[PDB]
Design a protein around this ligand. Structure first.
Ligand code: HEM
Ligand SMILES: OC[C@H]1O[C@H](O[C@H]2O[C@H](CO)[C@@H](O)[C@H](O)[C@H]2O)[C@H](O)[C@@H](O)[C@@H]1O
Length: 153
């Protein structure tokens, strides 16, 4: 359970992400797909992208990053009370997309790397720690839901 102070560190850096959610999403995808290429294979719609240039030029990939980060943002703003938000997410990711917890760890790593890079003003050690704590809570709760839905994760 995160403290209010920790949630504020998470929300303060997210406020910067919201200045340009599309741009942050693009950097996050490039970071993820380059660090862990296997994660790209899960996207039937984007698995043909061969280079960073192609990824950056993809309007649909950009749009999907907006969708993903906006959904994550809504979860973070709930400050732990995200039961309603996790239900549909866990169901599609467990049953349809089949995304292991390990891949959620990969994207969490990508998110943190991008925030560390773009936002040193609001992503110092304490802020990164709070963001990690928030993402671990997210994955923990998703893992529990995966279990209830019958997916090993
Ligand atoms: C921060 C974690 C994540 C969030 C908030 C998230 C969010 C979303 C949202 C909101 C959608 C659209 C609605 C839906 O299908 O549920 C979606 C679709 C999808 N997600 Fe995720 N996702 C996350 C991580 C991942 C990861 C790590 C992978 C893959 C390695 C993944 C693969 C997919 C796929 C395959 C789709 C469908 C893409 C398409 O429209 O063709 N997601 N995700
Ligand atoms: O922070 C690094 C550790 O990250 C992962 O573990 C955290 O998140 C898991 C959920 O994704 C939890 O089960 C674990 O308890 C958390 O510490 C990774 O699995 C660990 O190997 C890393 O050390």
């Amino acid at each position: 359970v995160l403290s209010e102070g920790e949630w504020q560190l998470v929300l303060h850096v997210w406020a910067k992400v919201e200045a340009d959610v599309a741009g942050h999403g693009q950097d996050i995808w490039i970071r993820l797909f380059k660090s862990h290429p296997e994660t790209l294979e899960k996207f039937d719609r984007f698995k043909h992208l061969k280079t960073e240039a192609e990824m950056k030029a993809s309007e649909d990939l950009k749009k999907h990053g907006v969708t993903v980060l906006t959904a994550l943002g809504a979860i973070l703003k709930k400050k732990g009370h995200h039961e309603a938000e996790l239900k549909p997410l866990a169901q599609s990711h467990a049953t349809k997309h089949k995304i292991p917890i390990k891949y959620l760890e990969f994207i969490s790593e990508a998110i943190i790397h991008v925030l560390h890079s773009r936002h040193p003003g609001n992503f110092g050690a304490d802020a990164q720690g709070a963001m990690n704590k928030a993402l671990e809570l997210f994955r923990k709760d998703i893992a529990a839901k995966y279990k209830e839905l019958g997916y090993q994760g």
